[PDB]
Symmetry: C3
């Protein structure tokens, strides 16, 4: 199971069932949960927790220090939940003390080749980061979001649930939930209707969201004006509450 | 010896005469490597995969992996690489899918530069150049002598025409006709790869006919059907113009404008 | 032992006494590493290459490979890296070509982040930051304190001026004068790196002269020659404005407007 050409540190803690391929390093204070397959040529540094039925592909560096000059050797964490797929050459950095000292990844995420998850970034669940997506630092990606290949996300930006970025997008402002964004700089186009139909959203929920988009984007309203209009549609439909909450929590403005 | 003893060579792998495998490389089950092919160190080959003769594959490359685009994979899907190809550091090439071609296909004399991605069921021809971090989604066809500048992104099902050129950071969402130069995200047609025509020894008459051929398609408000009819005569006279017309004829999903 | 036994040290390699090399790293023929330098695991160092003192080179990096550039034909060319440089994961640095100066040169105190590329015959000075996946094509000069944000692409022969800044995903096809801030694909001149100047402690008087110097080049309908002639006075008075004027004077591909 543990290939004899792998270096497993004494401090490491590997649940039974765990596979580690040859020439992989499981470093000091790295936990791995049952069912997790670590590939060949993987560098795991801690303090790091990895959950269950994860797959980490060759040439990935999971749990290294941020090179960001605002990090001076403090003991910070990286947590990864269950049923994640981390592909070839992904880099995931641990937190910094300045924020919450944790980089966090939930469950059922698909992180494609050469993606970068910067320090203190929070990834939720069932997210897809397509090839070479780069999250700068303190980036929050809520559940089911999809970032197309070579999507760049500025420090501290929030990526809403069910949001979609087009290929080569450069995001400098929050993307509300359900919103599709394209280009450099990134601009709002539409709602992720396919994402809603994926979730078996009621036809009434999809209509409430279709309208909610117009309130925010295509009706000349300010953000405070728009939050007021959405407050009843949000009280009625939980799906709209997600959209409304993503705009409310966007203190640094929304992607328009 | 040619096979470094720190490399893992599966019993089912077939190595031909003059093959080199550098240290800590994996030659997985049902990988076939042809005559004089050099596998660097830290290379992962996964099968079923057929690599031809006098190829060079650099460190940190993953050649023959499964697409992550499916969660439950198919077997057997194949990867076929021809002769005299250069695959540089950190390149990812995915095998085909059971739904579509069941094969990713690369021809001969191609240069695939560092960290380029070739997605499931894509077809590369001959004498192509994929510059650093070019990424092909899935079922992309790159025809002979196409050059994609670094960080070019190509959407699923798109055709890259022969002798075409993409500018750095191009995001191609529709077919690029033969010879056409495209730039930006989203990609826009600018001109033709006259530089590339001269290097292939194209007659100046064939180049003048291709310049007029660009105007017919792009600059004179014609339907594609009208463009094809208007090009028919030039196309009969010059094989070079026929390559252009044929690339436009085969675009079901529209051309890059 | 500071040399991991699983590492490959070519007999012809010249390592200072306290050099570290992690497991499964290759220090090839005619590679020299100065005192304090830590090489991580899974690094390929190829020569002829000189690395100075107190450098750090992370896993999956390929430092000193031949350029795939077709004009190179296996000639004996060099890479030279100075002291106190950080080279992050999967960085690729190519040696030079005989057509230029047969050398790729990196100075001191540079931070080169994950999957950056430094093409043949590139010259990087001191205190530069190349953020993730920055790609320099070839013969690119990046002068002191320049910051290039992630996925910045730089065309062959482009000069990146001192204390210059490029935004996320910039595509630089023309020279970036010193202090100038550029964004987007293609790169556009926005203003000057005042944030960067103020922080490094530039004089109020100097910043004010650079602001007017910016106006002169960009905002007064002057051609480059008329701009340089107008700059003559302030260039004469202020060094910072001389660096600016000089970076314009040495621009071979034009300047980013
Ligand atoms: C550049 C590259 C890497 C070759 O392709 C992509 O970036 N992504 C595709 C879509 C895609 C791939 N896997 C997925 C899984 C779930 C949902 C969508 C996808 C795409 O083409 N995105 C897009 N379309 N228009 N603009 N950007
Ligand atoms: C692609 C990726 C990694 C997700 O994002 C970045 O490139 N981040 C940079 C951060 C940065 C700014 N200055 C620095 C100095 C040293 C080190 C890092 C920086 C940025 O966000 N660049 C920018 N700013 N405005 N537009 N693009
Ligand atoms: C992103 C990176 C790696 C830093 O540079 C490039 O993409 N380089 C290409 C090189 C090139 C130009 N002409 C060629 C012919 C044959 C073969 C390679 C080329 C380019 O620069 N492409 C372009 N030019 N203008 N916009 N994009």
């Amino acid at each position: 199971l543990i290939d004899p050409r792998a270096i497993i540190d004494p401090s490491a803690r590997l649940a039974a069932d765990v596979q580690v391929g040859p020439w992989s390093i499981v470093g000091a204070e790295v936990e791995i949960g049952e069912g997790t397959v670590i590939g060949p040529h993987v560098v795991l540094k801690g303090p790091t927790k990895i959950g269950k039925h994860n797959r980490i592909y060759q040439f990935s560096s999971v749990g290294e220090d941020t090179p960001d000059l605002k990090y001076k050797g403090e003991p910070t964490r990286l947590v990864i939940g269950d049923h994640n797929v981390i592909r070839e050459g992904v880099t995931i950095h641990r937190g910094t003390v300045q924020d919450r000292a944790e980089t966090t990844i939930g469950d059922h995420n698909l992180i494609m080749a050469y993606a970068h998850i910067g320090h203190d970034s929070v990834i939720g669940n069932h997210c897809i980061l397509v090839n070479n997506t780069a999250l700068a630092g303190h980036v929050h990606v809520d559940d089911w979001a999809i970032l197309s290949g070579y999507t760049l996300v500025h420090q501290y930006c929030r990526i809403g649930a069910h949001s979609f970025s087009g290929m080569g997008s450069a995001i400098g402002k929050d993307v509300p939930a359900y919103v599709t964004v394209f280009g450099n700089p990134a601009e709002a186009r539409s709602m992720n209707f396919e994402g809603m139909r994926r979730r078996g959203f009621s036809s009434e929920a999809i209509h409430a969201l279709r309208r909610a988009y117009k309130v925010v984007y295509r009706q000349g309203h300010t953000v405070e004006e728009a939050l007021a209009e959405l407050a009843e549609s949000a009280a009625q439909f939980p799906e709209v509450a997600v959209f409304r909450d993503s705009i409310q929590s966007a203190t640094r403005g929304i992607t328009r």
